[model samples]
Structures are given as structure tokens and as C-alpha cells.
Target: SMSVKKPKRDDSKDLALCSMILTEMETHEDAWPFLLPVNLKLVPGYKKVIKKPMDFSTIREKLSSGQYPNLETFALDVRLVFDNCETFNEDDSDIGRAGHNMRKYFEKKWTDTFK
Candidate 1:
């Protein structure tokens, strides 16, 4: 008898990759602003303005819990963090500048990892 099979979609490798990249980002010098979810009271009106806020610490939690089913979705959340930053902050501002830099770093690292 012959059996048909499908190629294994190794999510573990991607998960590990997410782990490494995220650790680096978390420890990054300019990661302070993105280290945790925006504090509602600290940034007044933030919750009212930004519907879905994303952050590095939150991503780490998601990674640890294996909530990210795929690497693609993981990247989007990271991208969303930066997207919201730009939407609310000027490019030249400190947190906003860090946001852009971190986003660029993540993209470059992501490309080099998979591409």
C-alpha cells in the first residue's frame, strides 16, 4: 500500500526565530517606549484614539504562550505597533523616532532571516 503525505510546515523553527528576534528587540537600547503596552493613564486619551495598541512586551507574552499561530501574523502585530506610533507621533519625536528605527530594524532582520 502507498501513502500520500504533505510536507511538514515546521512552525517550530519560525517560533524559535520569533523568540530570538523578540529578545533582541526587547533588550534593544531604544526599546523603552515599546517595552510595554501603553499605560492608559500615563498617555491620556491613548485608549480613546488607538483602537488596538501593540507592544514588544505584549508580543513576548504572546510568543511565550504560543498564541502566534504563524510568523506572518507575528510580524503584523509588530508592524501595528509602529503604525500606531507614526499615527500618533511626529517622525522627529523621540518615541516616534525609536518607533521608526525599531520597525526598520525588525524588517531588515526579518528579511535576512527568511529571505
Candidate 2:
């Protein structure tokens, strides 16, 4: 029997690394434009899961790419997640702005987990 899972699956640490990677990606001039304005509908599933239960490994893959494909999709997904009643829509009219907050939240939590 296997005594270990090989690669560790620590959620707290992994999430932190993920945030760092995403934020770093956003720093590049090319990545900045791709992720800017944010997209809701286009928000992708976690990278590790993107190819699971299917074979779209290419899409699941990340890094070095100048821009994310389907900016429209990402933008829409962001809007939906944030605009929904439970996510945050304090004024009901500032849902889009909330998306920005959501991003910061994820980044902060993820980054903090690293410490």
C-alpha cells in the first residue's frame, strides 16, 4: 500500500501559491490587458481541475501565454459570481465593483495562507 500521496495536497499552502502565480501573471504587460476589467462568465475552474473529467489539457494549461483566451467568458463569469445576491451587491448597483473586491479577497486570502 502506498504510504504517501506523493505530492502534498495542502489546501492552505496551495491556495497561496496559486494566488502568487496568478498575481505574478497579471504583472506582465500582456497578462494585464488580458485579465483587466475582469470577467465573470469566463472565470476558469481551478487549473488542476480544468482538465479532469475531460481532456482539454491545453486549456487547463497555464503560463508563458501572452493572454488568456476567451476574455468575454471570464468577464461574464466574474460579473455573475459577484453580482449574485449572496456574493456581495451591497447597493445592488455596485455589483461590478464588488467583483474587484472579490478578486482582492481571493488574492489576500491566498497570499496570507503562504505566511
Candidate 3:
């Protein structure tokens, strides 16, 4: 038999990280614009989950309301929002590039916080 133990999850730490990540994304010029026109109506499951446009304010509300439990899940949610965007031209669009940059930035920030 093999027994493994996982470290206890810290809710306050997770929430603080979530807040920092969200604020950084909202304030960064490259990331903030991508968030503004995010019509959750176009993203699967978002229609049922969020009624407002996926702007910074809406994201703040969701975070403050404890809709996301941790940094990992919250980061995934942010990436999912970008993934669901269908209007960007993958190979030749500035928006596509910006989206990629934004996701990468969030991922790196998330990793850095733990280290």
C-alpha cells in the first residue's frame, strides 16, 4: 500500500494571489483591452455563469464573491475566456498575439508567486 499526503490548501493565500493576478491583468494595457469585449455569450458555459461582460469590474466582482477558489482555477478561468474568443485571426492578427502574451504573463506570474 502506498500512502501520500498533500499539503493543506491555504484559502487566504490563494485569494490574495487571485486578487493580485486579477489586478495586474486589469491594469496592464496589453491584457486589459482583451478583457473588455469578452462576450461570455460566445463562450460556452459562461452564458449560464456570468451575465455581465467579462470586463475588469466583472472579474473583480467574481473574485471578491469567491466564485474562484484558488489561483490555479482562476488562472484557468482567465485562459478559458481567451480560448473561447472566436474573432481573432490565429496566424496574422495583433489581437491573437496580445491574447497569447496575456495568457503567458498570467501563467508566469502565477508560478512566480509560489516561488
lDDT of each: 0.89, 0.39, 0.67
Each candidate's number of clashing pairs is 0, 16, 0
Question: Which has the higher TM-score value, candidate number 1 or candidate number 2?
Answer: 1
Q: Per-residue lDDT of 23-114 in model 2, one digit per residue for the tens?
A: 54345343322353323356554233332221112212332242334433333333333344233234444544444555556446445645
Which one is best on lDDT? 1
Q: Please write out the lDDT profile of model 1 over residues 1-115, one tens digit for every residue.
A: 2687788766668988888999888888988989888888888879899999999889889989979889998999999999999988999899989999999999998999887
What's the CA error at residue 57 for candidate 2, in Å? 23
lDDT of 1 at 83: 95
TM-scores for every predicted model: 0.89, 0.25, 0.67
Worst 10 residues of 3 by lDDT: 83-92
Q: What TM-score does structure 2 among the candidates reach?
A: 0.25
lDDT (tens digit, per residue) of candidate 3 on 65-103? 978766666766677656644333363567677777777
Clash pairs for candidate 1:
none
Mark the 10 consecutive residues where model 1 has the least summed lDDT.
1-10
